[PDB]
Amino acid sequence: PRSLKKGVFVDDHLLEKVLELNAKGEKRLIKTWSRRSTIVPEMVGHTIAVYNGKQHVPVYITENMVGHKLGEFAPTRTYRGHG
Amino acid sequence: GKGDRRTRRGKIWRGTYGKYRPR
């Protein structure tokens, strides 16, 4: 996985948004295209309407899911099965 | 063997060297 010599890479733009609400006043319903961008410990609480090719899935983050990426809570596939 | 990893031949198989194929 992503190097450690190479720090946790966030889009930086997705990143200003969050810290802009962390002290100035959270929270609002952002609609990120950022999936690469790891979840981060200034983002919990927020309602990052992450995108997935077609729409923005709201996913309120918590102290039980961050080390992953935003591409890991907005599914790209919808599969109720076969038959 | 050839498919296994934790082995010389398995690593020889897949052209890598590690704890069981030392350069």
Binding site: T62, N64, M65, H68, G71, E72, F73, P75 | -
Partner: protein
């Protein structure tokens, strides 16, 4: 269960025979045998009561094993299955997790084919 949490077979070499212990593998074989200085060629049966505990003891307080070992990787998954990440759905269905193939193959998390 002469061995912490399980009875290992005998007439076989200690080093190997430990692998019949959840969380005890080759890489961990020599370690204790090295740490316990117990020659891996001597058979478990042929072991010494003092060796037994030394090879028992040290093995018992440097890693996790068996029960408490299955106890971890479950929650590690159940959490996933709670947060519902991709590896969660791949377990929430019983599907491949490491980008594996799904049109065919993967017949190990699907088990024998089910008729249609």
């Amino acid at each position: 269960a002469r061995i912490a949490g399980v009875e290992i077979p005998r007439n076989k070499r200690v080093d190997v025979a430990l692998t019949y212990i959840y969380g005890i593998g080759k890489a961990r074989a020599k370690e204790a045998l090295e740490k316990t200085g117990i020659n891996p060629a001597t058979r478990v049966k042929d072991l010494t009561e003092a060796e037994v505990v030394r090879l028992r003891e040290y093995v018992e307080n440097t890693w996790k094993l068996e029960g408490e070992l299955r106890a971890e990787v479950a929650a590690n998954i159940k959490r996933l299955m709670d947060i519902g990440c991709y590896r969660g759905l791949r377990h929430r269905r019983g599907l491949p997790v490491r980008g594996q193939r799904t049109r065919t193959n993967a017949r190990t998390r699907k088990g024998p084919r089910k008729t249609v």
